Structures are given as structure tokens and as C-alpha cells.
Amino acid sequence: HPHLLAERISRLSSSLEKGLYERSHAIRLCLLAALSGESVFLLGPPGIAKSLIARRLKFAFQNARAFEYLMTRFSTPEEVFGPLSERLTSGYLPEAEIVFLDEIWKAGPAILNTLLTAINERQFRNGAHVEKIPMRLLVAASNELPEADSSLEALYDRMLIRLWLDKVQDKANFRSMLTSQQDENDNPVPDALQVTDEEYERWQKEIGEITLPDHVFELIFMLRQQLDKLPDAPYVSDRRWKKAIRLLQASAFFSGRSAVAPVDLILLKDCLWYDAQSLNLIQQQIDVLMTGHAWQQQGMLTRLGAIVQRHLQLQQQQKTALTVIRLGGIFSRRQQYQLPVNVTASTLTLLLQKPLKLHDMEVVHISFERSALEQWLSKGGEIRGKLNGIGFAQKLNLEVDSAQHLVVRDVSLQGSTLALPGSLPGEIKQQLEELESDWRKQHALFSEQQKCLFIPGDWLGRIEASLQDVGAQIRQAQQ
Amino acid sequence: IDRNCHKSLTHLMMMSDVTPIYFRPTRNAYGILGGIPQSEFQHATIAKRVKETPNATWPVHAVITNSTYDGLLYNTDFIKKTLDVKSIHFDSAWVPYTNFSPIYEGKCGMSGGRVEGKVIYETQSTHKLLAAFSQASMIHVKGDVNEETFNEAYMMHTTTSPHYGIVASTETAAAMMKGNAGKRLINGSIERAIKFRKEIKRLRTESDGWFFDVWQPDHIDTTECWPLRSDSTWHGFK
Ligand SMILES: Nc1ncnc2c1ncn2[C@@H]1O[C@H](COP(=O)(O)OP(=O)(O)O)[C@@H](O)[C@H]1O
Numbered sequence: 241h242p243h244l245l246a247e248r249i250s251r252l253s254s255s256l257e258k259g260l261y262e263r264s265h266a267i268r269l270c271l272l273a274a275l276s277g278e279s280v281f282l283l284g285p286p287g288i289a290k291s292l293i294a295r296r297l298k299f300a301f302q303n304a305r306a307f308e309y310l311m312t313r314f315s316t317p318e319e320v321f322g323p324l325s326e327r328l329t330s331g332y333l334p335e336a337e338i339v340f341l342d343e344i345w346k347a348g349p350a351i352l353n354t355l356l357t358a359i360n361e362r363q364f365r366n367g368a369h370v371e372k373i374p375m376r377l378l379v380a381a382s383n384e385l386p387e388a389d390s391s392l393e394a395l396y397d398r399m400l401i402r403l404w405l406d407k408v409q410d411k412a413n414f415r416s417m418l419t420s421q422q423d424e425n426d427n428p429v430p431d432a433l434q435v436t437d438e439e440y441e442r443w444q445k446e447i448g449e450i451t452l453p454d455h456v457f458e459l460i461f462m463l464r465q466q467l468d469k470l471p472d473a474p475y476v477s478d479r480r481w482k483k484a485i486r487l488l489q490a491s492a493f494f495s496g497r498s499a500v501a502p503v504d505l506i507l508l509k510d511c512l513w514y515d516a517q518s519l520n521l522i523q524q525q526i527d528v529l530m531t532g533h534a535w536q537q538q539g540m541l542t543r544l545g546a547i548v549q550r551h552l553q554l555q556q557q558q559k560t561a562l563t564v565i566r567l568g569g570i571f572s573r574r575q576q577y578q579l580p581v582n583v584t585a586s587t588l589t590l591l592l593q594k595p596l597k598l599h600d601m602e603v604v605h606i607s608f609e610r611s612a613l614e615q616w617l618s619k620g621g622e623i624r625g626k627l628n629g630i631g632f633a634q635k636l637n638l639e640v641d642s643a644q645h646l647v648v649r650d651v652s653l654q655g656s657t658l659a660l661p662g663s664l665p666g667e668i669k670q671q672l673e674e675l676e677s678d679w680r681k682q683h684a685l686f687s688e689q690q691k692c693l694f695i696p697g698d699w700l701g702r703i704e705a706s707l708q709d710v711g712a713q714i715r716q717a718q719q
Numbered sequence: 720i721d722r723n724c725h726k727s728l729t730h731l732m733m734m735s736d737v738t739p740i741y742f743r744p745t746r747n748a749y750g751i752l753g754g755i756p757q758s759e760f761q762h763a764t765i766a767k768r769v770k771e772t773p774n775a776t777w778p779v780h781a782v783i784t785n786s787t788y789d790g791l792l793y794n795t796d797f798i799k800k801t802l803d804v805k806s807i808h809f810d811s812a813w814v815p816y817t818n819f820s821p822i823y824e825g826k827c828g829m830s831g832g833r834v835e836g837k838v839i840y841e842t843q844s845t846h847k848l849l850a851a852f853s854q855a856s857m858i859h860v861k862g863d864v865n866e867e868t869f870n871e872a873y874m875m876h877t878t879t880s881p882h883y884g885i886v887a888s889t890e891t892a893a894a895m896m897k898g899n900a901g902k903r904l905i906n907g908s909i910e911r912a913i914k915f916r917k918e919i920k921r922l923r924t925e926s927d928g929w930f931f932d933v934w935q936p937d938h939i940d941t942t943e944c945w946p947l948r949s950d951s952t953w954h955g956f957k
Contacts, residue, residue, distance in 0.1 A: 468767065468770075469771075
């Protein structure tokens with residue numbers, strides 16, 4: 241049942257896009273805020289399809305009312321909500337569903353005070369008491385930006401989505417747009433794709449039931465701390481973070497998912513900035529976060545770089561000697577330490593060059609105990625080691641060498657430098673396949689949730705390029 | 720705690736279960752570390768690294784290396800007002816003389832008055848640039864501290880039989896500087912230092928070849944502390 245919901249939404253927005261080219265980000269975003277109870281703001285020059293999107297989304301319902309109003313410098317509240325006789329609000333805003341308000345940055349002080357109460361509580365005073373408003377989508381467009389210290393910032397800080405529209409730039413998409421025959425006043429939405437009033441009240445409750453994975457909280461909390469490190473970043477209060485959770489839960493709900501997906505963080509690019517200066521800062525930090533901490537992009541770079549450094553170090557170890565390192569600290573006797581990641585076994589064996597006659601017999605390999613080698617090289621004493629891997633741990637005359645080696649002395653005071661038996665090294669290939677397998681696991685999640693309708697198309701060229709860059713580099717060292 | 724800390728300050732963080740916050744002092748290319756910028760003392764900076772670093776509360780103590788190992792005094796007139804710390808420490812282990820000269824007013828923690836709600840901690844060395852036996856130090860107090868219970872912590876590192884030969888020489892350093900007969904040693908050391916600075920520039924141009932250079936401004940005619948401005952090239956601090 242949840243899988244069939246993503247197909248019905250994809251077909252609903254298909255007819256809405258027919259007639260407005262290069263405006264998929266301004267139409268698909270308004271559908272998410274209408275089915276979840278959010279708002280949206282537009283900005284740009286008058287004439288980039290800003291009022292038609294408010295009159296196009298009403299055809300996707302069955303009981304929607306349009307309201308295209310233009311705020312002026314001498315506008316009165318009695319001409320916006322309805323003149324009083326108690327207020328004749330027949331087809332305006334208190335009983336409408338989708339209202340449009342253009343040039344909102346020039347109304348009076350009484351109009352702004354009424355728009356703040358119709359968003360948080362969906363109520364509006366009517367002389368004495370208040371009443372509910374069945375508003376589903378709130379859209380507002382303009383052209384200029386408000387002041388830095390004014391009373392108009394109380395409404396801008398409450399809106400969620402801040403769309404950034406612009407004129408057309410592509411030449412291929414302008415040919416059919418210049419001579420379009422699609423009418424903007426008909427009903428291109430079929431009668432089978434329109435939702436009813438019963439399905440709307442049920443979807444408003446199932447949004448809050450979406451679980452919040454632990455991996456998603458690690459990216460949202462990190463993004464909040466990243467914005468605090470930049471003094472030029474816009475100030476975001478706790479009210480925006482509470483409404484941002486509903487935006488991500490509603491996006492994955494209509495995409496055939498039951499939990500919050502990490503790909504839903506792309507919609508946060510239009511919910512933090514406020515002007516043209518902060519526009520290039522919010523879209524920049526999210527692009528690094530999505531291509532650095534979302535699918536563990538940088539998490540694989542800190543491990544691949546260590547393999548390249550380790551591959552060059554093993555070139556002089558894989559003829560074969562054994563260099564003993566000195567452990568740190570202030571001690572009287574010059575203590576020695578074993579090898580770290582090179583050897584890990586407990587009863588490993590050690591070879592030798594010139595053979596000696598120990599205990600009146602020949603030997604070709606001597607094995608030492610890891611639990612006994614760490615104590616003799618630190619606390620001192622005498623070491624005990626068996627011969628040819630058999631017998632008991634007999635005592636030997638082992639000492640330290642000037643070139644950091646293991647010289648085994650016998651009854652004739654002869655030297656014998658010990659060494660470890662040798663085997664793209666095996667350690668490099670073992671550590672590389674584990675990192676390469678993690679890239680396929682992170683790419684498998686991205687090769688399933690990319691069909692989300694609420695994702696901009698221009699971001700697919702940057703997220704996929706970031707995953708292919710690591711894959712092209714991890715396959716070069718294995719050549 | 721300051722980033723440019725001494726070996727003694729490292730063992731302090733290893734014996735107390737605290738969460739220190741390290742700063743980022745300025746530096747050049749010759750290796751001479753500058754000082755902590757003024758942006759690290761504002762109110763938007765102290766609580767900035769507290770929430771980012773897990774397991775950290777409001778800082779109740781601040782250690783400032785003033786001066787550093789090379790000898791670079793800071794500006795205490797701006798730290799005592801901007802830095803909102805009720806326990807600001809000044810590591811004055813290299814300047815036991817910022818009082819007996821008028822070119823040091825308002826440059827150290829002892830110069831000025833009692834800051835309301837704060838206290839100045841200075842551990843000036845005694846057997847470094849004075850005249851006393853080894854194993855001697857002082858603890859300056861500018862405000863209100865502890866003494867009854869604090870004496871128990873002092874006895875944890877000091878034996879019950881102190882060596883009076885060091886104590887007699889420790890107070891002697893405070894008596895050798897009192898009066899005009901002691902103030903001539905501070906001003907006399909400055910006059911001999913400025914004279915040595917002028918002899919380097921005199922033997923540099925008149926010489927035929929390379930010669931040593933003193934890290935000093937182009938104008939050293941005055942007798943005071945040369946400030947590090949922003950329109951100079953001798954300090955090289957960006
Ligand atoms: N970028 C665009 N692509 C396609 N059609 C557009 C575009 N901009 C405007 N239009 C068309 O112009 C008509 C009027 O748009 P209008 O409401 O004046 O836009 P705005 O509200 O931004 O001034 C609409 O029916 C729309 O189809």
C-alpha cells in the first residue's frame with residue numbers, strides 16, 4: 241500500500257508541470273506544503289510564473305478556492321479578509337484553501353498583525369471570538385527584500401520554504417515555451433488523481449508517525465553546529481528546526497518510505513537563508529555535508545589515504561630483516577618493544593640466517609611466545625623459547641643488537657640475526673576490500689531512493705559525481 | 720588554558736578531571752609566536768566551543784600566557800573587561816618587574832585596580848630573572864581568594880620543614896627592588912638594552928657585508944614598549 245502512493249503523486253505533478261517549463265522546483269515544492277500544512281515564499285522579477293502556480297495547484301483537489309490579491313501601500317484589512325456589516329468573508333481567506341498574496345512587503349501594520357495569527361493557530365478574529373480556517377497552502381511572492389531592522393521580519397522568519405525563481409536561460413526550453421498552446425485556465429488534472437477531503441485529514445496525522453533514524457539525527461545536529469562556526473551564517477531559532485522535521489517526514493511519506501531518508505536533507509537549502517548574501521553560504525555548506533558526511537564520502541577518504549601511505553611503507557619490508565623499535569618512557573635499561581600491526585599471532589615463528597648448534601642439535605626456525613616476549617623486553621630477565629616448534633621452552637642467549645635486531649648467542653659466541661618468515665601485499669588487499677565493500681553499501685541506498693519526486697534535478701549531477709570520484713580513485717591503487 | 724603552555728601546565732591537565740579549551744594564538748614564519756587575538760575573548764567565543772565539545776560546562780578559569788617565552792606583553796586593559804572569566808590566570812613567569820617603571824602601567828594584571836567579580840592569578844618566577852636561590856616562586860593576588868582551606872592544598876606539595884635559606888632570598892628580591900635604589904636596576908637594564916639595540920643598526924649600514932638584525936620597529940628613539948601596529952612590516956603578523 242505505501243509503495244503505490246509514490247506512483248500516484250508522480251502522476252499528479254506530471255499534469256501540473258505541463259505548461260510551465262524550467263519551473264519544476266516551484267511547482268513540486270508547493271504540492272508538499274499543501275498536503276502537509278506548510279507555507280512557501282517566492283522571490284524574483286514580476287513575470288517569471290509566480291501567480292499561476294497558486295491557481296494551478298487548486299485543480300489537484302476537489303474543494304479548493306483561489307484568491308489572487310495584490311497588497312498595496314494603502315491597503316486596508318477590510319478589503320483583504322472581507323468588509324464587515326459580522327465580517328462578510330464570502331470567498332476570501334478565512335474560508336478559502338489556497339490564497340495568493342503578491343508584493344507582501346508593503347502592507348500596513350494592521351495587515352501584518354493579522355497574518356501572524358493565521359499561521360501558527362490557523363485562526364482569525366471576527367469582532368469578538370475567533371474561528372478556524374481550512375487553509376491548505378500559503379504562497380507569497382514579491383520582488384525586493386525588506387529592511388534589516390523592521391517589523392516585516394516577523395512574518396519572513398515564520399515561513400518554511402524560500403523559493404529562488406529566475407528567468408529562463410536555456411535556449412532549447414525556450415522554443416516550445418515561446419509558442420505554447422497549453423491553456424492556463426482549463427483543468428489538465430484528471431478526475432482520478434484528485435484527492436478527496438477524507439484523505440487530506442488522514443494524511444495530516446500519519447506524517448508525525450514517521451520514525452527518526454539515529455543516522456539522520458547525526459546529520460541534522462551536525463549541520464546546526466556547522467552554521468554556528470560561521471559568523472556570517474544567518475541566525476536560525478528553535479522554531480525553524482521544529483518545522484523542518486515535518487518537511488523531511490512529509491517528503492519521504494509520499495515517496496514510498498516509512499522512515500526519514502538521508503536524501504531528504506536537500507530541501508533544507510531553501511529554509512535557512514534570507515537574502516542574497518546568505519544564499520551562497522547555505523547552499524555551500526549543505527553541498528559539502530551531503531558530499532562529505534551523508535553517504536560517508538569523507539569517511540572513506542580518511543581510510544583510503546592511509547592505504548596509499550601503508551602501501552609505500554611495505555615496499556621495504558616484504559632480504560627480509562626484523563627491526564626492533566624502542567618503547568617510550570624513562571627507564572634505566574634500554575627496553576625494547578615488539579612490532580605493532582606487522583605481527584599479531586601469539587605463537588609466531590622466527591627464521592634465521594646462519595644456523596647454529598643449540599642444545600647439541602640443529603634448528604631452522606625458532607618460535608617465541610607473544611605473552612612472554614613483551615615481559616622479557618621490558619622487565620628484563622631471561623627468555624625461554626623452544627626449538628623447531630617442539631619440546632619445552634628452553635633458555636637461549638638472546639641479546640639486543642646495535643642495528644636493532646635479535647642476535648642469538650651460543651656456546652661459541654657466534655652471531656645470528658633473526659627474521660620473520662615472508663608471504664599487491666596481503667595486508668593492503670585485505671584492508672582495501674573492506675573499504676570498497678562499504679562504498680557499494682552506501683551506493684545501494686542511493687540507487688533506490690533517487691526516484692523521489694521532491695528532489696531537484698540539478699543535484700543529481702553533483703551527488704553522483706561525488707560517489708564516482710571515490711570509486712575511480714579506490715580502483716587505481718589496486719591496479 | 721592557552722595553547723602555548725609550559726611542561727608544568729601539561730601535568731596539571733593530567734591530574735584534574737577537567738575539559739580544557741585550547742586557543743589559537745597568532746604566529747609568523749620565523750617561529751616567534753604572537754598572542755591570542757581579541758576575537759577569542761568576546762562573549763560569542765567562550766560559549767562557542769563549549770556546546771561543540773561534548774562534556775563541557777561554563778568555563779570558570781582561564782590561563783593566559785602573558786608574556787610568552789620570547790617576551791611579548793598583551794593588553795590587560797581589554798582582557799579584564801571583555802573576557803568574562805571570574806578566574807583569569809596570567810603566566811608572568813618571565814616579567815617580574817612590571818611595576819617599577821612607568822612604561823608598564825596597565826600592561827599586567829597587578830597594574831590597575833580590583834576587578835568586580837573577578838580575580839587575577841599570577842605565578843611570577845623568582846629564580847629566573849631576579850636574585851634568589853633555586854626552587855622559589857610567588858603567587859600574586861588582586862581581589863579575594865582562599866587561605867584557610869587553600870593552605871591544605873599548599874602543604875600537599877610542600878614538606879613540613881621548608882628551607883628558610885630560599886625563603887629569606889625570596890623576600891630579599893622584593894626588598895632589593897623597593898625604593899629608588901632598586902628602581903635604577905629596572906631602568907638601567909632598559910637603557911642598556913636600548914643602547915644594545917642601537918649598536919646593531921649602527922654596525923649594520925656602516926659595515927661591508929651582511930650583519931645581524933634586531934626584531935624591532937624602524938623607530939626606536941622612544942623609551943617605552945613598542946606596540947605591534949597593523950601598518951608595519953617588522954613583525955610580519957598577518
Ligand atoms: N518561466 C516561464 N515559463 C513558462 N511560462 C511562463 C513563465 N513565466 C511566465 N509564464 C506564463 O505567463 C503567464 C502569466 O504569468 P504571471 O502570473 O504574470 O507571472 P508572475 O506572477 O511571476 O508575474 C502564466 O500563465 C505563465 O504560463
